[PDB]
Amino acid sequence: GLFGAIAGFIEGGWPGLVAGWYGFQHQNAEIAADRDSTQRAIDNMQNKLNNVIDKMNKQFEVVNHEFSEVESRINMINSKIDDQITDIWAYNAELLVLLENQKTLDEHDANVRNLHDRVRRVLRENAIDTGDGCFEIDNNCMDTIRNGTYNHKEY
Amino acid sequence: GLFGAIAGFIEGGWPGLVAGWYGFQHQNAEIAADRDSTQRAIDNMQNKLNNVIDKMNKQFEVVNHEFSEVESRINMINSKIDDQITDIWAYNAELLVLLENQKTLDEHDANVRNLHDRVRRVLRENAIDTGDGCFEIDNNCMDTIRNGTYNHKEY
Amino acid sequence: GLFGAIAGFIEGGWPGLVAGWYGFQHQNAEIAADRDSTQRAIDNMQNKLNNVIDKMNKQFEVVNHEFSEVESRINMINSKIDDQITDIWAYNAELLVLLENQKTLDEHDANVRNLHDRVRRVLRENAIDTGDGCFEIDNNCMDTIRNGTYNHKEY
Amino acid sequence: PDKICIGYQTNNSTETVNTLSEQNVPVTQVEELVHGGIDPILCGTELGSPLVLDDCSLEGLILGNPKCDLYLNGREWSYIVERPKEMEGVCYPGSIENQEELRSLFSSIKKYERVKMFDFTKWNVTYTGTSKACNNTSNQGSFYRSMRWLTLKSGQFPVQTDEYKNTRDSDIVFTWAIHHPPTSDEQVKLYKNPDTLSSVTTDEINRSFKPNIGPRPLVRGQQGRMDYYWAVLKPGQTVKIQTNGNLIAPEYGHLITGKSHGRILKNNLPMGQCVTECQLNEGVMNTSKPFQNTSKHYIGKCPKYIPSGSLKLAIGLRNVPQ
Amino acid sequence: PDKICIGYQTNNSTETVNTLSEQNVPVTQVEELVHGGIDPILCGTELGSPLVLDDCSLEGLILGNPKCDLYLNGREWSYIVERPKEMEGVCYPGSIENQEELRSLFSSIKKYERVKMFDFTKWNVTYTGTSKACNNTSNQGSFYRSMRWLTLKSGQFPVQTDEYKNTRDSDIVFTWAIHHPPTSDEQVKLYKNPDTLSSVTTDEINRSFKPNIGPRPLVRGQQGRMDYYWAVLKPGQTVKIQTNGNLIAPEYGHLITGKSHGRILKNNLPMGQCVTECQLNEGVMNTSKPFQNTSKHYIGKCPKYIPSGSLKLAIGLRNVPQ
Amino acid sequence: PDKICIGYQTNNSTETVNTLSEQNVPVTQVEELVHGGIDPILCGTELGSPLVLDDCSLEGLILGNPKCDLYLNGREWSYIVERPKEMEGVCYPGSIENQEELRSLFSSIKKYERVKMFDFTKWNVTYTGTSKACNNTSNQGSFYRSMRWLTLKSGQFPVQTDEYKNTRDSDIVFTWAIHHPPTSDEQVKLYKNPDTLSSVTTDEINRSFKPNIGPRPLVRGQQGRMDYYWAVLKPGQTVKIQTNGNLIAPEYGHLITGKSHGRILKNNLPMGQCVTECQLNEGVMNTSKPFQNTSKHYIGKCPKYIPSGSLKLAIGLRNVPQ
Numbered sequence A, B, C: 001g002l003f004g005a006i007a008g009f010i011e012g013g014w015p016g017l018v019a020g021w022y023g024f025q026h027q028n029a030e031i032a033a034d035r036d037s038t039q040r041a042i043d044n045m046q047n048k049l050n051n052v053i054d055k056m057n058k059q060f061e062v063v064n065h066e067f068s069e070v071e072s073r074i075n076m077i078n079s080k081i082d083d084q085i086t087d088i089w090a091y092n093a094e095l096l097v098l099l100e101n102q103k104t105l106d107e108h109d110a111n112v113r114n115l116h117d118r119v120r121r122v123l124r125e126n127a128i129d130t131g132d133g134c135f136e137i138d139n140n141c142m143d144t145i146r147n148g149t150y151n152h153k154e155y
Numbered sequence D, E, F: 001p002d003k004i005c006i007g008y009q010t011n012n013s014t015e016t017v018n019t020l021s022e023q024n025v026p027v028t029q030v031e032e033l034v035h036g037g038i039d040p041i042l043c044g045t046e047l048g049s050p051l052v053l054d055d056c057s058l059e060g061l062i063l064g065n066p067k068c069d070l071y072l073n074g075r076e077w078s079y080i081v082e083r084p085k086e087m088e089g090v091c092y093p094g095s096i097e098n099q100e101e102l103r104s105l106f107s108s109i110k111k112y113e114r115v116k117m118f119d120f121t122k123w124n125v126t127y128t129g130t131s132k133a134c135n136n137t138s139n140q141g142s143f144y145r146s147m148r149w150l151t152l153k154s155g156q157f158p159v160q161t162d163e164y165k166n167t168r169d170s171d172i173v174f175t176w177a178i179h180h181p182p183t184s185d186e187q188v189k190l191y192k193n194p195d196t197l198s199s200v201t202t203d204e205i206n207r208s209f210k211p212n213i214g215p216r217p218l219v220r221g222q223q224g225r226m227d228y229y230w231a232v233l234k235p236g237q238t239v240k241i242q243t244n245g246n247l248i249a250p251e252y253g254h255l256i257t258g259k260s261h262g263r264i265l266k267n268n269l270p271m272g273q274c275v276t277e278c279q280l281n282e283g284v285m286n287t288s289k290p291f292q293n294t295s296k297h298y299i300g301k302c303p304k305y306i307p308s309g310s311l312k313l314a315i316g317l318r319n320v321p322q
């Protein structure tokens, strides 16, 4: 992907993570999903889906007309209109799905990269980036990192 | 946003900055906009606006036709053409604005991230990234950082 | 560009690099292209080109009709259909090329940034980022960095 | 040593999506945009139930074919269905001028009811004519219910004339016809005049017709042939008939009101007791999906037609095994 | 300690834009793409000023209705406007064949001027006929200026014939008609012949017409009725008339030249002294914006029509308070 | 000190691409999407070789004009070409009713061959009529090959009648016409009857025609004029002719079979020995490119038409000198 997080430096995903898309897995003395980034992502993929359904929602009633043997031209002219409008919509419908699928996969890729960055930014000098989406350093301190309240000045 | 600079790690903007979009605010012994990135951004948003106006600029004169009581079909066939072409343009016009708005907001988001990166790259070991778009370290030296001439070997 | 690698912090390209797009140039005691990122890029630009050709591949045979002096309206109605469908395709054809060109240039920009990041991530503490796409530190060790097998624990 | 890591979801979903740069990309969550199925049944819409026709065609129900006596009381509909088979329309051989327009006009309107325009009791000619071509359900020689065949009375056919004015506050559709005898004897036996002048006139139209004696090829065991016509009488307007032979004069007209869906579907679908939002010639449909692949020709609120069988939109992220 | 920081702009702008993923996103700078207003006035284009009609319809100006004597000198236009009200066109009851085409052809051309085709001084029949149906402005019994009503002279109507050739280096549009008397007496009083043969022939067309005696419903206090016709005579071609009664013969034709906008607008807008790039039935417009929402039907260089009232494009970045 | 660096490609390519945000962006690799050229030649398609016409028009080949005797044996085609010049069609002055439809129907079908419908040996009238208007290649007074001019025999013209039934298992296209003499003498010399009744009837159509004596302007040195007609006889149907003068009766009909491309091209292109996938009025074309800019009107498998001369897609990256 463009942002090189999903199937990049974080090679694999977590099957244990069922609650949401993006989450934290620690290892201390003693797995959960981040509700800030994941809820904001769900909002974007419900508003996107609705807009796609809304843009296609307008209807027009295409009547079938009868023509005599001496009305060959106006019959051909009518069939052209129906065949040529359907081609434009078949193009639009197919093309929009290929364009938004590519953006959706890259949007998810960016959400992980941003969540990895904002944790690196709050921890500062205390931890070291392994380079596989991990940070070598209490359950409160691990919980203060999750909700983004960790004070590096304390440690 | 995708690049996670605007409303990300730099939480808020500066109301004092009126001259341009992106700029520098320092604090030394003794606020201004970067003219390289901001001018290059204005070029992209004048060429984009012009291309949108140009793509819609082509005109065709849609005449109103009169039909008798025995010309019901060719009247219906004519009304279908006008109603179905307008739907395709109404779709295109509406869809193009939703697609380019999303890109514009994310393009501005990337311009800040790049301007934050190129300052981090020139300063090197001398400064420390606070993680809120700031760098703890003369007016000449602050001016040499702005135009990207700062020599880290001197300090 | 959005990712600020191509014509960004790496100011210039290498005319010596003919084998592929992205590559490595070192300087040790004793130039080549990365085959992982470059092959994956070629796959995306062959599948993209094919999809553009496929979406336009559907044909319809637009007949020329003859009309008498008393058939002025149905002649005008027929000419409107042909002139208005061609405008929509002329728009689509022109607009799709401007949209995908912008994405292609930014996709190439991201491929370099990702290749610069994954080398920085494998080397870890041993090297120092100059800030012009270089890393100050055997031909085997330089070869182990290329294919991404370098063990930083050894040094 | 204590560590913290950021990671993403994966599941045993076999769903793939296409992009412009890559084919069949595994993803976690997907949404199908194309409804593939139909329920092959005819349901009623918000305008009401449709008029299904399996015995009589529409032009036979207008002309009042004697095998279509069921529909004399009058009908209203949301849309019209015609069975694609041999249907009883025009009984006596001949063509309807602007037939495609007549069927289009009559299907456009919601309701129709018969109205008596001309009283043939006062007319000084015989109006009780029948034909073997226009048999009733009992195979008795009959004729159209909405028109009368005018022949001679006491060995004479004088110049007849009568008027009718529309004061119903609604349009009336009426039909007439010109009979063309095969031989010279038929013209002198039926009407008694070798050459006749017939004409139908209103406030807007002015139409006149002549016969021409000459035999035709047999169509329904009849050497003769008719030329059928129709017109529309607006509220307040006046229609006036005049002939000295060779007219199938109008007795009844059709009082038309409201707007239908303006549709004649052609299917063998079973009529079901149901209400629907969308109705196709292929069947009925109720879905949340933006697309459908059964037909572009539909009536009511329906999804958009594309020829694709399946379109998958990515909701979730790339499905990456550990 | 000395520090340096990178930041972005914010202002007190209440402007929001929509994206595919989010509704109403605050931004710093915006551009409106839809012009919402019109100036409800009729202006002239680069082809010239239009022909506004509030007294006479177009088919009355062609036929030369005696209440439309203002337009005998001839007119040229950029486009034509007709007031949507009761307009004076065809005075004598009857229909124009291919009326929609005639109006379409005549509006397509820029300029027209009258030309005398047939001289009725040499003709051996009376051509001074008038009717109460075709009153002039003073309510005197008159007739069409471009056609003459041919009746009997000294109790006879011989077979008349005359020729006219077009040598003006431009097309000519002319009209004729066939009168259908109500009674048998009217046919013998006016033309004196119970049955008459009339015909109009050129190098391309060959047309013949018969009357048919029969009364009609009253339209403008007249039991009679006419059938109006028209044709186009090309440069070098020859038209030749021939009758023995029952023709409204052409005296004048219309010499047509150039191309107009080919448009008949239907509005009650005031005619203003102004030049314009774009003209609508709803009004006039001059803007830099790519879109407009007033009508799809326009003439000249105009923005694209969409039904949306407002479309906002993001120029600036997301508006984030400190 | 040992160092490693990451970098990208550059070359001496002068190729530029446009984006929405920037004009003329240098890039390494590009793909042209618009084929700009054509080969100005007429080639045959997968249906076969076309029928090129430089001497006779299509309506003259149907009527059987005596200068078009080359095409009596019959032809089949993929498509039809007509040279844009003075072509020999209808020899005797007159118009073909529904001419645009006849040409459309006849071009739609693949193959045609002549079939004798009516035998004039048994008919009791002279059928050997010719005209100076319809000269053969040797400038001898001749007539149409598919129709016969019926005149009087031994100073009489009785009421003639004959029947033909189609049992070929394929449609037949036939033409007739009505002659309108200029003077009264011509009507009595040719047909001997001042007023005549002609009619053409089948199982579906019922048509009758009257002459009208009156001179016309000279077209091809002929004061007279004809009115040409056509019809289609389906398999099993029966056509029957009947007249007492004033008919150009059908002798031969055209047996039609299969489907063509249904096209009449209008060009002066040279006929070449070649097979093609796509054929235009402007020439022939074989390319891998998705777009082309020569014409929207084409036959066969062809790229999409856009008015742009060149469209460049970026394959490589931005071209940045060191």
Ligand SMILES: *[C@@H]1O[C@H](CO)[C@@H](O[C@@H]2O[C@H](CO)[C@@H](O)[C@H](O)[C@H]2NC(C)=O)[C@H](O)[C@H]1NC(C)=O
Residues within 6 Å of the ligand: D036, D037, D293, D294, D308, D309, D310
């Ligand atoms: C519309 O698309 C559908 C779905 O692809 C097709 O109908 C069938 O759908 C069922 C599932 O509901 C599949 O199991 C069948 O295999 C599909 N049919 C076929 C032939 O594959 C159908 O092809 C399309 N319908 C029409 C009328 O074209």
Ligand SMILES: *[C@@H]1O[C@H](CO)[C@@H](O[C@@H]2O[C@H](CO)[C@@H](O)[C@H](O)[C@H]2NC(C)=O)[C@H](O)[C@H]1NC(C)=O
Residues within 6 Å of the ligand: E036, E037, E293, E294, E308, E309, E310
């Ligand atoms: C076209 O859109 C415009 C703008 O939304 C509408 O016209 C009015 O515009 C003014 C501002 O110039 C607003 O104050 C009014 O409220 C708008 N009218 C309404 C009813 O809201 C108008 O709706 C549209 N015009 C047409 C003819 O459809």
Ligand SMILES: *[C@@H]1O[C@H](CO)[C@@H](O[C@@H]2O[C@H](CO)[C@@H](O)[C@H](O)[C@H]2NC(C)=O)[C@H](O)[C@H]1NC(C)=O
Residues within 6 Å of the ligand: F036, F037, F293, F294, F308, F309, F310
């Ligand atoms: C279609 O586009 C082509 C290519 O731009 C034009 O034809 C010529 O193409 C050759 C190269 O094959 C150029 O050297 C010529 O300069 C082009 N002609 C012109 C006038 O520039 C052509 O303009 C277009 N063809 C049609 C029929 O419109």
Ligand SMILES: *[C@@H]1O[C@H](CO)[C@@H](O)[C@H](O)[C@H]1NC(C)=O
Residues within 6 Å of the ligand: D132, D133, D135, D139, D140, D141, D220
């Ligand atoms: C009408 O009925 C008669 C006998 O009553 C029969 O001879 C004739 O064939 C019938 N007509 C048709 C068209 O079936």
Ligand SMILES: *[C@@H]1O[C@H](CO)[C@@H](O)[C@H](O)[C@H]1NC(C)=O
Residues within 6 Å of the ligand: D122, D123, D124, D160, D161, D162
């Ligand atoms: C014949 O019928 C007409 C109306 O059609 C009527 O006016 C007339 O009185 C009738 N004839 C007689 C002798 O009453």
Ligand SMILES: *[C@@H]1O[C@H](CO)[C@@H](O)[C@H](O)[C@H]1NC(C)=O
Residues within 6 Å of the ligand: E132, E133, E135, E139, E140, E141, E220
């Ligand atoms: C024409 O004028 C006469 C009196 O001069 C009048 O009786 C008649 O009603 C007028 N016609 C119309 C249609 O107003």
Ligand SMILES: *[C@@H]1O[C@H](CO)[C@@H](O)[C@H](O)[C@H]1NC(C)=O
Residues within 6 Å of the ligand: E122, E123, E124, E160, E161, E162
């Ligand atoms: C009657 O008019 C015709 C032309 O319409 C003319 O040729 C003829 O001479 C006139 N009659 C007499 C007796 O002059």
Ligand SMILES: *[C@@H]1O[C@H](CO)[C@@H](O)[C@H](O)[C@H]1NC(C)=O
Residues within 6 Å of the ligand: F132, F133, F135, F139, F140, F141, F220
């Ligand atoms: C037909 O040929 C004759 C002489 O054989 C000639 O006078 C006449 O002009 C020719 N017709 C045409 C239309 O050329």
Ligand SMILES: *[C@@H]1O[C@H](CO)[C@@H](O)[C@H](O)[C@H]1NC(C)=O
Residues within 6 Å of the ligand: F122, F123, F124, F160, F161, F162
């Ligand atoms: C005249 O021709 C008809 C057929 O057109 C035929 O039936 C008749 O026998 C012929 N006349 C004579 C006297 O044979």
